[PDB]
Short mmCIF file of C-alpha atoms in Angstrom, two decimals:
data_model
loop_
_atom_site.label_atom_id
_atom_site.label_comp_id
_atom_site.label_asym_id
_atom_site.label_seq_id
_atom_site.Cartn_x
_atom_site.Cartn_y
_atom_site.Cartn_z
CA UNK C 1 -27.85 -3.25 -3.22
CA UNK C 2 -26.50 -0.64 -0.73
CA UNK C 3 -23.55 1.73 -1.68
CA UNK C 4 -22.29 3.86 1.22
CA UNK C 5 -20.79 6.88 -0.25
CA UNK C 6 -18.09 8.60 1.99
CA UNK C 7 -16.28 11.82 1.60
CA UNK C 8 -12.90 11.57 3.15
CA UNK C 9 -11.75 14.68 1.12
CA UNK C 10 -10.96 17.89 3.23
CA UNK C 11 -13.43 19.71 0.96
CA UNK C 12 -17.32 19.28 0.24
CA UNK C 13 -18.13 17.12 -2.81
CA UNK C 14 -21.55 16.49 -4.44
CA UNK C 15 -21.96 12.79 -4.85
CA UNK C 16 -23.83 11.63 -8.00
CA UNK C 17 -25.20 8.32 -9.07
CA UNK C 18 -26.77 7.51 -12.33
CA UNK C 19 -27.13 4.76 -14.91
CA UNK C 20 -27.14 7.38 -17.91
CA UNK C 21 -30.81 7.61 -18.56
CA UNK C 22 -32.06 7.81 -14.98
CA UNK C 23 -31.04 8.62 -11.43
CA UNK C 24 -29.90 5.75 -9.03
CA UNK C 25 -31.62 6.31 -5.84
CA UNK C 26 -32.01 10.23 -5.40
CA UNK C 27 -29.12 10.86 -8.02
CA UNK C 28 -27.07 13.15 -6.01
CA UNK C 29 -26.38 14.84 -2.58
CA UNK C 30 -24.04 17.15 -0.96
CA UNK C 31 -21.33 15.36 1.18
CA UNK C 32 -19.39 17.75 3.49
CA UNK C 33 -15.95 16.47 4.63
CA UNK C 34 -16.50 13.25 6.61
CA UNK C 35 -20.15 12.73 5.60
CA UNK C 36 -21.48 9.43 4.60
CA UNK C 37 -24.65 9.06 2.37
CA UNK C 38 -26.19 5.48 1.84
CA UNK C 39 -27.95 4.81 -1.38
CA UNK C 40 -30.01 1.81 -2.57
CA UNK C 41 -29.36 0.64 -6.27
CA UNK C 42 -31.90 -1.81 -7.72
CA UNK C 43 -30.58 -5.43 -8.33
CA UNK C 44 -29.88 -5.84 -12.07
CA UNK C 45 -28.65 -2.33 -12.59
CA UNK C 46 -26.34 -2.26 -15.70
CA UNK C 47 -23.97 0.42 -16.34
CA UNK C 48 -24.36 2.43 -13.18
CA UNK C 49 -21.88 5.04 -12.27
CA UNK C 50 -21.06 6.99 -8.99
CA UNK C 51 -18.68 10.01 -9.02
CA UNK C 52 -17.88 13.15 -7.16
CA UNK C 53 -18.61 16.63 -8.25
CA UNK C 54 -16.40 19.68 -7.10
CA UNK C 55 -17.15 23.34 -6.64
CA UNK C 56 -21.02 23.36 -6.90
CA UNK C 57 -23.66 25.96 -6.49
CA UNK C 58 -27.46 24.95 -6.31
CA UNK C 59 -30.38 27.05 -5.72
CA UNK C 60 -33.48 25.96 -3.53
CA UNK C 61 -34.86 23.93 -6.53
CA UNK C 62 -31.62 21.91 -6.77
CA UNK C 63 -30.45 23.76 -9.99
CA UNK C 64 -27.13 25.24 -10.58
CA UNK C 65 -23.65 24.26 -11.66
CA UNK C 66 -20.47 22.16 -10.57
CA UNK C 67 -16.99 22.92 -11.97
CA UNK C 68 -16.31 19.11 -12.39
CA UNK C 69 -18.82 16.54 -13.02
CA UNK C 70 -21.94 18.73 -13.56
CA UNK C 71 -24.93 16.53 -14.76
CA UNK C 72 -27.21 19.05 -16.63
CA UNK C 73 -27.18 21.56 -13.85
CA UNK C 74 -28.91 19.43 -11.46
CA UNK C 75 -28.25 18.47 -7.59
CA UNK C 76 -30.00 15.21 -8.25
CA UNK C 77 -28.35 13.71 -11.25
CA UNK C 78 -30.43 11.86 -13.76
CA UNK C 79 -27.53 11.62 -16.55
CA UNK C 80 -23.77 11.24 -16.59
CA UNK C 81 -21.53 14.10 -15.52
CA UNK C 82 -19.36 16.53 -17.54
CA UNK C 83 -15.73 15.35 -17.68
CA UNK C 84 -13.40 15.23 -15.95
CA UNK C 85 -14.71 12.66 -13.55
CA UNK C 86 -13.14 9.77 -11.93
CA UNK C 87 -15.83 6.94 -12.27
CA UNK C 88 -16.82 4.06 -9.93
CA UNK C 89 -18.63 1.88 -12.56
CA UNK C 90 -20.76 -1.21 -11.81
CA UNK C 91 -23.04 -3.82 -13.24
CA UNK C 92 -25.08 -5.77 -10.73
CA UNK C 93 -26.71 -9.28 -11.00
CA UNK C 94 -25.31 -10.06 -14.55
CA UNK C 95 -25.76 -13.75 -14.90
CA UNK C 96 -25.27 -14.27 -11.05
CA UNK C 97 -22.23 -11.77 -10.54
CA UNK C 98 -21.46 -8.21 -9.89
CA UNK C 99 -18.80 -6.26 -12.07
CA UNK C 100 -17.01 -3.21 -10.50
CA UNK C 101 -14.21 -1.05 -11.77
CA UNK C 102 -12.83 2.43 -11.52
CA UNK C 103 -12.31 4.33 -14.73
CA UNK C 104 -10.21 7.45 -15.97
CA UNK C 105 -11.62 7.14 -19.60
CA UNK C 106 -13.75 10.27 -18.77
CA UNK C 107 -10.72 11.93 -16.87
CA UNK C 108 -10.10 12.42 -13.15
CA UNK C 109 -11.22 14.87 -10.72
CA UNK C 110 -11.30 13.31 -7.14
CA UNK C 111 -9.36 10.19 -5.76
CA UNK C 112 -11.47 7.21 -4.96
CA UNK C 113 -11.62 3.70 -3.46
CA UNK C 114 -14.48 1.56 -4.55
CA UNK C 115 -14.61 -1.81 -2.44
CA UNK C 116 -17.30 -4.23 -1.56
CA UNK C 117 -18.47 -4.22 2.14
CA UNK C 118 -19.67 -7.95 1.89
CA UNK C 119 -17.30 -11.05 1.18
CA UNK C 120 -15.93 -12.61 -1.92
CA UNK C 121 -13.87 -10.07 -3.91
CA UNK C 122 -11.34 -7.16 -3.55
CA UNK C 123 -11.79 -3.50 -3.88
CA UNK C 124 -10.27 -1.20 -6.64
CA UNK C 125 -8.62 2.13 -6.05
CA UNK C 126 -7.33 5.21 -7.90
CA UNK C 127 -5.88 7.43 -5.29
CA UNK C 128 -2.78 9.00 -6.76
CA UNK C 129 -2.51 12.79 -7.25
CA UNK C 130 -3.63 12.81 -10.94
CA UNK C 131 -4.65 16.54 -10.62
CA UNK C 132 -1.37 17.70 -9.37
CA UNK C 133 0.84 15.51 -11.85
CA UNK C 134 -1.82 16.12 -14.97
CA UNK C 135 0.07 16.91 -18.17
CA UNK C 136 -0.29 20.57 -19.15
CA UNK C 137 -2.43 19.88 -21.99
CA UNK C 138 -4.92 17.70 -20.16
CA UNK C 139 -5.29 20.09 -17.22
CA UNK C 140 -8.99 21.34 -17.09
CA UNK C 141 -9.24 25.26 -16.45
CA UNK C 142 -12.37 24.37 -14.42
CA UNK C 143 -10.46 21.77 -12.34
CA UNK C 144 -9.32 18.22 -12.80
CA UNK C 145 -7.32 16.36 -15.42
CA UNK C 146 -9.16 15.63 -18.73
CA UNK C 147 -8.96 12.41 -20.64
CA UNK C 148 -7.36 12.89 -23.99
CA UNK C 149 -10.56 12.05 -26.07
CA UNK C 150 -12.26 14.96 -24.35
CA UNK C 151 -9.48 17.31 -25.17
CA UNK C 152 -8.61 16.39 -28.70
CA UNK C 153 -11.67 14.44 -30.19
CA UNK C 154 -9.71 11.94 -32.33
CA UNK C 155 -10.67 8.44 -33.40
CA UNK C 156 -7.43 7.27 -31.62
CA UNK C 157 -8.14 8.75 -28.15
CA UNK C 158 -11.96 8.16 -28.32
CA UNK C 159 -11.42 4.62 -29.77
CA UNK C 160 -14.19 5.39 -32.25
CA UNK C 161 -13.51 2.55 -34.54
CA UNK C 162 -12.41 0.00 -32.00
CA UNK C 163 -8.84 -0.21 -33.24
CA UNK C 164 -7.05 2.32 -30.81
CA UNK C 165 -4.08 1.63 -28.91
CA UNK C 166 -2.62 3.03 -25.63
CA UNK C 167 -1.29 6.61 -26.05
CA UNK C 168 1.11 9.06 -24.11
CA UNK C 169 -1.78 10.45 -22.31
CA UNK C 170 -3.50 7.03 -21.49
CA UNK C 171 -0.09 5.82 -20.15
CA UNK C 172 0.00 8.77 -17.76
CA UNK C 173 -3.28 7.77 -16.18
CA UNK C 174 -2.11 4.13 -16.19
CA UNK C 175 0.99 4.92 -14.53
CA UNK C 176 -0.54 7.00 -11.71
CA UNK C 177 -3.52 4.48 -11.35
CA UNK C 178 -2.62 0.95 -12.62
CA UNK C 179 -6.05 -0.28 -11.26
CA UNK C 180 -8.15 1.92 -13.31
CA UNK C 181 -9.25 1.91 -17.05
CA UNK C 182 -6.94 4.51 -18.80
CA UNK C 183 -8.46 4.15 -22.37
CA UNK C 184 -11.47 2.38 -23.93
CA UNK C 185 -9.43 -0.80 -24.94
CA UNK C 186 -7.27 -0.97 -21.78
CA UNK C 187 -6.60 -4.30 -20.35
CA UNK C 188 -9.60 -4.66 -17.97
CA UNK C 189 -9.16 -4.13 -14.36
CA UNK C 190 -12.87 -5.13 -13.70
CA UNK C 191 -13.42 -7.18 -10.45
CA UNK C 192 -15.99 -10.01 -10.31
CA UNK C 193 -17.94 -9.83 -7.12
CA UNK C 194 -20.82 -12.38 -5.95
CA UNK C 195 -24.16 -11.27 -7.42
CA UNK C 196 -25.93 -8.84 -4.78
CA UNK C 197 -22.88 -7.58 -3.06
CA UNK C 198 -22.96 -4.32 -1.24
CA UNK C 199 -20.15 -1.54 -1.66
CA UNK C 200 -18.77 1.49 -0.23
CA UNK C 201 -17.31 4.43 -2.55
CA UNK C 202 -14.80 6.52 -0.58
CA UNK C 203 -13.61 9.86 -2.03
CA UNK C 204 -10.15 10.70 -1.14
CA UNK C 205 -9.38 7.35 0.67
CA UNK C 206 -5.84 8.06 1.69
CA UNK C 207 -6.12 11.83 2.88
#
């Protein structure tokens, strides 16, 4: 499956793509403002994620740090990034179908649109100014708007037991972005696409 990753932000982002235990394609790359990077994701990929990282520094070997979404200091991500990270999430070729969503469960850093480039389903978007509107207690000093589980580490926010409900903090993400997951047990906003669809992830889709 192809995923065209486009940076429409006025700032550079370092795109990342991983399934948690391995990179997807090269795993990461710098995207200056306006740049497009097309990756190939193996059919059958389950639990894949794409995200942006901001304010990165990498040396010649691809080692360094990002202020948001850092994946163990690597340019080429092999693991998930450090919150806050707006997430484009996907599972492909799952009994003949693809499943996509945007999630704020690990916070928000950069606005994003995640849409198919092929027929048969709609895209999902979280493009509101969540960083600007972020509640004081969730603001990440390193940049971004943290989720409440990251900040407070309680069973209720982290949905440790599976009993959790919505919270004042999850409702903030849900109000700004109704089409993204705001907590672990949120009412799903996952879209079913034909199996083997192709996609485009656009950072800062509106500006």
